[PDB]
Amino acid sequence: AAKGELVGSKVLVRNDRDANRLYSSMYGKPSRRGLQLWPEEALFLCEIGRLEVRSGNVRISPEELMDRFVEEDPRFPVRYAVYADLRRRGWKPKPGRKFGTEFRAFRGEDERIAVKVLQEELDEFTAQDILEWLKLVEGTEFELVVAIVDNDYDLNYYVFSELVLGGELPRAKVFEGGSLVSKDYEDLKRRYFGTEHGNVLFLDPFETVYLTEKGEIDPETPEGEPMSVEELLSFFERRRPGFRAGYVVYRDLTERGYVVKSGFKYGGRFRVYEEDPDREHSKYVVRVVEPDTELSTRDVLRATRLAHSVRKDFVLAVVEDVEEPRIEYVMWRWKRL
Amino acid sequence: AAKGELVGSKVLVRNDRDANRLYSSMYGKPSRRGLQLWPEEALFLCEIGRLEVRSGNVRISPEELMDRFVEEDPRFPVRYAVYADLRRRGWKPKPGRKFGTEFRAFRGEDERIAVKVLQEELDEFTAQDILEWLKLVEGTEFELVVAIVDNDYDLNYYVFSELVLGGELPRAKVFEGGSLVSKDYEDLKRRYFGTEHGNVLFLDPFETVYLTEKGEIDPETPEGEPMSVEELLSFFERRRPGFRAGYVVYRDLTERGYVVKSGFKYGGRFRVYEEDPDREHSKYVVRVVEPDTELSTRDVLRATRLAHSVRKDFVLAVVEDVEEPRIEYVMWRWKRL
């Protein structure tokens, strides 16, 4: 085994031959004094018997080394669970500050990930935080991987990525649940708007606002008066959370030729079809948020596990400005590394 | 077809023969003037051609009847989606106020349900509300069924039910993530406490508090001083939400001989085993709340769909009093009616 000296929180390997051998497996960072191993690297090498560590003239066991590193940094075992698993799974993880992540990890000649480690309970973040994590790896060969560690050190990995999208009126009687179209609705129905029951077409609230804005229906009050788009938004938002932000995402998707319906049954605000709902499964499950919306590890686990169970992609739609509008889409994919 | 007269929001069927025939299929309520049909019943019968409805001398079409009923009560189409589906699925739903539910529904001689209808966005409720819904059917032959209607009138059904549960120290070095036991931990490990890595046992925060309270470990600070149960609760709760309530549920389950671990990966606070985790799958996914905790339709869908995907039962643990403690358990089961 290579011999290392613990100095502060780094383990130095002075022997040139051993340092070269370890570095050829992507352990450590060269330094003026010799190869410097990060705590995760030193502990891993010590546990598998490839490194002996001394502090002064005292041999530090793998158990004592874990103890030391946890005392120095309470987050160490969380990071280390990911480090050791990545090494086990064939990756070469390099601790560092690049990309704002805990590790950059390499596999083969083509696989490159920046690994953001989150603890089940201790790490809070917003949608804006996710945008900022992504921005750091944008235009690079590194994928953003979020590694979530639960309280008992079991792991889940996610790839977060940018999604770029492709792509004489009927009377609509407005009510709390959208609007009712009783006559001349067949065209709208064939274009996948609304839900037909018997010989009446029900439009949901977003469909009602959208088709009004696009000049496809004339919405009316019970007394037969028109309602404006703004009057509809005001009416519907009273008891429906995030309605205006949800609407601009509904409108963006629908403008582009997607078909948008309730995503309730799949755990989202929307389920989204590419073309023909009668023929195809919906492709995306979409949640709408704003930059300051607080998110959780629980959101990431639940959203992706649900989406996976029905073979759909989960998408976070971040409405950055409601009135312009400005919207960005982030896919979350549960991934085996 | 039977002839009915719309009076207010009820349809009266005066013809004794037709009234008797309809009532034999559990439509309507007898009245001094004849059989009185609820809006849901009248519309359903009218849509399937078994009833003709007049208002005064004017024939009201099924489409016009829907229009009238929605204008009178914006929640009608939400209720009606459930009513019509229950009739389709072989149930005989009776509108009324009994049990505080929208319907009592009957099938065969043995199936009896009280159906609580929730709209995807418009209906908010608490854990206390669920306890109150359950209390109304407690000790009766009726099961509590929650029917959730999404914005586009697709449906999901849930059975909510009561769950009644069955059933010289090692040094533990406390840190942010629980505690570390380096020596004499094999007994605790074999009893399924903690997570072994190499030759060290990691105890998570609830395990650390529990095993301290039960006199199974001596927790210590980095300077070697003891910590009390209350000091541990105070330490861990600073950055962990609902910690004290979560702890009393952890303790209740573990006292009874269940094995409790993080439920993160299955969308809960806990995953719970009956006996032997190395042998068995966990049986329950548990979320801990308090009576005033706000819940949503989204919680019900997501929790049960996730639990179903891994063939586990989702359980809501309501901590009604932290200090006594007083805890009740409610199972949520996604069900095909």
UniProtKB/Swiss-Prot annotation, chains A, B:
Highest taxon listed in the record's lineage: Archaea
Active site: 273, 281, 312
GO biological process per UniProt: tRNA-type intron splice site recognition and cleavage
Iron-sulfur in keyword set: no
EC number: 4.6.1.16
Keyword set, alphabetical order: Lyase, tRNA processing
Catalytic activity of the protein: pretRNA = a 3'-half-tRNA molecule with a 5'-OH end + a 5'-half-tRNA molecule with a 2',3'-cyclic phosphate end + an intron with a 2',3'-cyclic phosphate and a 5'-hydroxyl terminus
A GO term for molecular function: tRNA-intron endonuclease activity
Family: Belongs to the tRNA-intron endonuclease family. Archaeal short subfamily.
HAMAP family: EndA_short
Function: Endonuclease that removes tRNA introns. Cleaves pre-tRNA at the 5'- and 3'-splice sites to release the intron. The products are an intron and two tRNA half-molecules bearing 2',3' cyclic phosphate and 5'-OH termini. Recognizes a pseudosymmetric substrate in which 2 bulged loops of 3 bases are separated by a stem of 4 bp.
Subunit structure: Homotetramer; although the tetramer contains four active sites, only two participate in the cleavage. Therefore, it should be considered as a dimer of dimers.
Protein name: tRNA-splicing endonuclease
Species per Swiss-Prot/TrEMBL record: Methanopyrus kandleri (strain AV19 / DSM 6324 / JCM 9639 / NBRC 100938)
